[model samples]
Target chain A: NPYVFHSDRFRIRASSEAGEIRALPNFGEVSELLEGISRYRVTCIEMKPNTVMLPHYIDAKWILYVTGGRGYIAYVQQNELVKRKLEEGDVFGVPSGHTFYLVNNDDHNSLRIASLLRTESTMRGEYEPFYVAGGRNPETVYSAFSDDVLEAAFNTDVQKLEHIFGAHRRGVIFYASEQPKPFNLRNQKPDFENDNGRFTRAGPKDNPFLDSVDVTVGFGVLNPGTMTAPSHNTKATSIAIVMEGEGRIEMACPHLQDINYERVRARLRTGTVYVVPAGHPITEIASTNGRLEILWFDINTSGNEREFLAGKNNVLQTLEKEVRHLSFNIPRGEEIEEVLQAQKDQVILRGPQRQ
Target chain B: NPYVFHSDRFRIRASSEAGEIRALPNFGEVSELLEGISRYRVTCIEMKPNTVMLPHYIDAKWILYVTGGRGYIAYVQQNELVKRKLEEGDVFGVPSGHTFYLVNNDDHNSLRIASLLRTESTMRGEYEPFYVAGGRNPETVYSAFSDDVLEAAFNTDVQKLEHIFGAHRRGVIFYASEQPKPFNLRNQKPDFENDNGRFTRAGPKDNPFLDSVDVTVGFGVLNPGTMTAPSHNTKATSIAIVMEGEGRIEMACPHLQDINYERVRARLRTGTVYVVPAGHPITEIASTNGRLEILWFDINTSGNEREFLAGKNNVLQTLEKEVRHLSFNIPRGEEIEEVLQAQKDQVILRGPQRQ
Candidate 1:
């Protein structure tokens, strides 16, 4: 159905026939379950190094994660152009209207990336990838406009517009000079939470995905023995996968859980996957057995967002006294709320000593 | 990497050892790629019809789509007990605080669902599925509470509370009697966006996933040859798959596009996937080749929300005349803005006559 699409059986084989730059598109199943609410599409793209994916605006938004190799992405945001240096396991965002290009930095390696795209109304057909630069193959945007419009827009002679419009006859993917290295990582600050061990997290405002995805796509880390606070998301379904070492998850989700409401424990080892749907009160404990790390993709399906039920941030304290009394149907409802409101913690919880 | 996980390869073989509901927990390669921003989890669960998942509260958020078969889910919501009757392809939400149970409603089939779960903080360990009713196998929330508290809180005798808590010892999945189904779908309205043909759409307000996902998740249908209005999302990613019939699409997302800014036409047939990332101008056209129907998912990852840039409802029409002129650097600014705002269209645009 529209609920799941496996990458293992993704369109790779079909796309491999396309060439060196292979892109495996998804099942587009989100439409069935997520419907029109989800505007983004996820895809996997692999490109040979020394290849240059030209600069053009899709008029749509995009986020990319480099799965392999190293690269440089040059883009124009508004009127200013910027550059980002990336290596395997790096994520970054590309605005919908911005013109951007990517270059595989090394000749010895291929640059592989996974991307998410959002799409449209009317005009029919599938999605259209526009190239504002190239024209020989399919008239360029410059050519689409009047000659005088180009003259005024470029502030150069019409002949100069010739080079801008007619040059590339090559297919969408093209070979270019090897990407030069030495680009450094962007300077960023991280929010760290130390529990039995340590943890650090960053998001749209902080991570490459940017706050634009309308979803929370970010990075997370958990040292050995560290446990996340037992918390509930206001309204979001989370998808996470382990990276290194091993992790163990004891969960109590809606569709799956023991009658006793005990831990529906699942292994959170490398290559393992799990989700905490919107409104789930959960605890994530790093395996005391080994150091663990993970990556999370969270979507606040509703505005519920994240509200910790435990620790100092617990939502119980915010409830009106009457609301608590009515909710618990008890005389000591306020006192119960106070008890629930008492924990003083944030992201992590203490477990086995890190030492 | 974390980008793709086919259920085929998710974790059935490993979880097969557990039986029935095999959870494919992913700390996907995203950990290696994202490091830490990925804490949420995604899962797929399948249970035979006539099965009962015990009464338990996960203390976590959960969302599920009954991908196959039919069932009845009973859970506490707004501090009250509620039951939902569901059939194939139905989606619903389960609150983390509420204790709920599910029973397959069919005599000859199984219940299948796709779910997402969020993880935790503090209290230690990964996650714990707390059963509010289970007694023999695991202590429940009722047992954890004092007898007086249970007697008073539930307005029932302590012995009854004991019975309530002491019943089921079977694991998560258990056989159950036929589920009586009478629950009606929640009352909500759909926004119609008819194209070359007729189409009906719904949103979070209508879907169980709700707006909690913070993205657009809904249902859609496109009659053959129907074309939608050329519109743009404020800031969202879009994903759509064909539930039935065939569809076509033309997209121009940044980083990927045709050399001419021309149509990047693609087949939107069964299993086809496409997107219109935030900000990109798009026109969705149904296949004239045959009766085309499809579903779409859209998300605004960053900040700006959905605002169509074309038609009388076009975002540009809302901009101040001076702002438009200054931005366009054209002398005929207001007039240009008016021209851009000429169309009085909202969602779709009719195309290819029915005859």
Candidate 2:
């Protein structure tokens, strides 16, 4: 009871079958019990290059990215739909209530897509992929309704609805690379940029989901030698993962009554998942060799919208002129736009090029 | 060759003449290579009492402060400015491209002032001080431009620019106490609060700089024997430096997957550098001595700018109201917020006011 379920220590779910999928509700309350919300939840999908996770959507907001191989994201709501290619650098966020499927196209490379659940479900490890079409490990939403209601909703005879909607009980994830037939039809035509990049993002408004009253998620890329300004989120705290390539990160924290911020310089390469908290200043610098891709999850306590302090969009630039002149004691009427206007880019910039 | 360079291992620059100034391009990829941006840059100035650095502006943002002895911070930005007396507890920041200098007033104790460069210049170690008047070993920014353009723009003679900017060969950081006779400046007038206090700043807004998107830095003051919520920066991830007194910090990361956050209990005194990364939470307890001033830099990865996760502000309280009602969560809300609401004041709480 006193033990906490840290992400590092979460156990593989019983539903996992090696290359199939693994779900870990790595949840816990280490010190005192957090009375209501659940901690972070993750689903590890590991499958052969050619497979498809059938039509189903989660009730919680999910940030999905292909960790390895290639996973195509296809999800749809009767009124809306989404289909896109997800690669090493693609950030695809599917909203809650939309049924989506993951299809691995690279027939040889095993596909690995990691999804973190942003919402706190009812119980620790209670979240499941509810099936809309195919079969679900969790019962179909149709299972709850009475026969007549189900039939009416399906617009078909009761027995027919059962026969058609019934799960063959094959499994959640199935094979799909060269399929001739399966569901009614193939969802088609959505593409990510051949130039999948990161860093310069204003956002789906700071993030792409709604589960972030607590933690939010975002993605970015770093070209060789590029870097994010050394700063912290005012409304959100954050941590990052290096997907590919590597680089250096430096963190400086406040000294309460003192003046100088102390330095915590660390190196991060592919697979490095580290955090730099809110109110803390952190600088992420991509290496000089290749582009570095990163993923970050922010806990949204800083605010609904976070602001950058560097580049052309720094929020402090909006501080009244008096505060600037008085706070910085800048010379009278010596337009500071020259200085504050130094950086124009908001979230990403090129690192000093080395010869 | 693809390896990154971490800050903990940055080598000091080769250009220091004893207690003068030490530069650490301290540059390198911390891991593989993120592709761009330098980690962070720093300049260490350990000067003897009564020394002054001439007028110069760096191409980077800087967080300035004194660590060892008494240092005087004074600068002229034309229209207005701030001059503060820095001692054991003064945090100051000077804008980029602004001309500023440091001085030591104490004729005995050497002042060790360190400035951390925030912006990763466009070149690895590209950060250099551009002196408007004194000559530097590094060629002038003006030199890059044509002589005619430079002279015409400078509004002064080209020879005058070279004469004023050129250093006959004195050190970059030189002694200016009573024995100095290099440049012309004894500019003075800085006033740090007679009160340099902290533990209650959700703040330079309590932090010094302005670049935060998630992580934030703040200040706090702990009366003798005060214990902050014996938990980590829950809603916020953080680490703190005890500025004035001593204290104990307890931390807990993940255990065997059951759940919640526990133990890396440690005691801290002034000048101690400590951190409580995410997943692993922390709690601060002030010692029973004189008042304890604490400085902390928070990286707000914790969802919602929350400072504490374990104590009072546990995640459980955030569980959907329905989840709390039906799943039969632990505490009753009426009694719950009432209990936590009691701890309404999060920062600068009392531990022990001393006997």
Candidate 3:
């Protein structure tokens, strides 16, 4: 019950002519496995071609994963507008209180993005986007202020204020008549690459906006019949959603008395979700049938690291022979070395598969 | 700022004829290091001897560490009342929805307890106890029902109901003249003991109440000039309050790209709090002049373990030589063994002390 949430649990957050937002059931409403990841919310948003999501600020920090098609993003950074062109595999983040807008400038395809939302005033269960550019249905923040306050703030007459605040009938996301300036920008390169899979991360240091929020966004595509090295994040609690195919996950925990470790296992299919609390050892193995795709939203990433426990670059590789002998109670270090070197791979290795 | 939080930030949650309840600042109001620890709240409550704390049920799960005196605890479990005797060093838990009451039975000393509160419906900043026994000041939950509903439910007249519900004029906690039944019960023993110090924990399996919530409570006393072995939790975020003396904490993280690890250091004294996020390597050293006493509240402890990095029983001790070679990039495991055996002690060891 604590793991393997299916796609059927998604609740439609927003739906309009422009796009739709489907949010997975909040962790509080789901299993205890995600208790540590409860403070953050997971959602997927899709925008129709030529659509623009209105400029808005949210009470939560957001890390965005560009999953499909391409889009243009404009967000406020230190009161200056910073623009970026995003495509599939690109990851980025927006700190809380940043006003941002997205435009799916594609001629025929839709832009799909997955998001991890973390409210600074967390544990509140939910957060809302304070739209700055909206009308009627998705009312603008300006509507809350008195007409006098609005007029004085804008230094304009009530007529103009009314037109600015109330005239638009289009929803928060709607078709944009004019195209934005095309930027000749390239997408991010994979941080880890091998025959088994490739991983790309938008880390805190990769952008100032992400640094302030201390979040990391990552995307991975693992070849069928391969498995990720057993690893654990030093400080971050990660939530991963399967984008395609299926896989198996195993987590090791030393929770029960009289038992050194207990295995928490689960299966993941497309549109399913799983969580890995910080420091818990975990491994994910893809099925032999097809490629497995996943997205990761890691919180508390300010100084987090994925420390592998197995494979070529495992943390145990540097241990002294005496330490190893003490740990395994084996007299020789070569025995452990022989087992560790059997994998021959680093992050991803061939899994136990049937012919 | 992410680790240590001084005592000056404590807010008085309750103070009256009875002893006060002082709560450390909520993590939401504190540093970012506690982001994962935000779901639980830390509070210290002291009740004057011969006092009765009225029956109440909090929206949060509570694990209590008895720090002083003796008390009689009565709480509902599975529709039946379960009673237990509590004294110094006793650790117990009460799940959310279980109405519980505490009585300070001691004639001379105050009953002091440090509580870790975890609200099931969490992430909201604060929680309140729904008093089942109270008057006007601390209104009872029954007060919310209409007079008709109350009268029908109780099958009594309004006058009788009024007296029954409103007769109490005393506060939530007031001195009791009646002497409660005393069944002899001993306190918990240290889970780990050594010359340097001892450690105790009230884990999930220790009690059914804690198991339901998956929380663990721990207490430790480190002798002067001693330091804990470098370690990390497998899946729990720990918030430790310094009960006495001073100490220094150093956390190692591989947050920076160019650096393998960065040191996040801080100093702590009595009444201060520090957080250790899961998987982050940390060590706490007591000041040379005095012993350091700490109380720990760990969340998500269902399958957690403190995996130490060094000392007599370090995790590296049993590793194979080949794994050690790969990790340290050393050809011979004996060289690493020479360095590991230098520390003769485990858990708590002689610190880098001032002569």
In terms of DockQ, the best-performing candidate is 1
A-chain TM-score, model 2: 0.55
Give the clash count for each candidate.
157, 123, 22
In candidate 1 the C-alpha lDDT for residue B245 amounts to: 68
lDDT of 1 by residue, B1-355 (tens): 2222333434441122112554444342323432232333445566665566655555455655554677777764433346677776565667554556677758888776555444432111123465433455545433433333223223334554454344545555655423222212212224444333444334454454445554344455555656666776776555454445665565554434345443556655554444454556676666666665444444433343555655556667688868877888876536785677555455565555542
Q: At residue B355, what lDDT does model 3 achieve? A: 16
Best by lDDT: 3
Best by TM-score: 3
**Could you tell me the fnat of model 1?**
0.05
In model 3, where do residues sit more than 4 Å from their true spots? A1-355, B25-35, B77-80, B122-126, B155-164, B167-169, B177-190, B253-262, B315-337
Ranking by lDDT: 3, 1, 2
Evaluated at residue A237, the lDDT of candidate 3 is 84
Expressed as tens digits, the lDDT of each residue in A237-269 for candidate 3 is 888989889988999866523658778888889
Error of 3 at B82 (Å): 2.9
The digit string of per-residue lDDT tens for model 1 on A1-355 reads 2222333424432122112333323223433223322444455566676777756666556666565688788877556767778886676777666777777758788886655555542331124556776757545566677878878987888997787677767655567722222211212214455544443334554544445555555456666666665555544556565556775554444333223332445555554545555444556667667767655556543243454433555443444343323323333324454444334445565433431
DockQ of the candidate models in sequence: 0.04, 0.01, 0.01
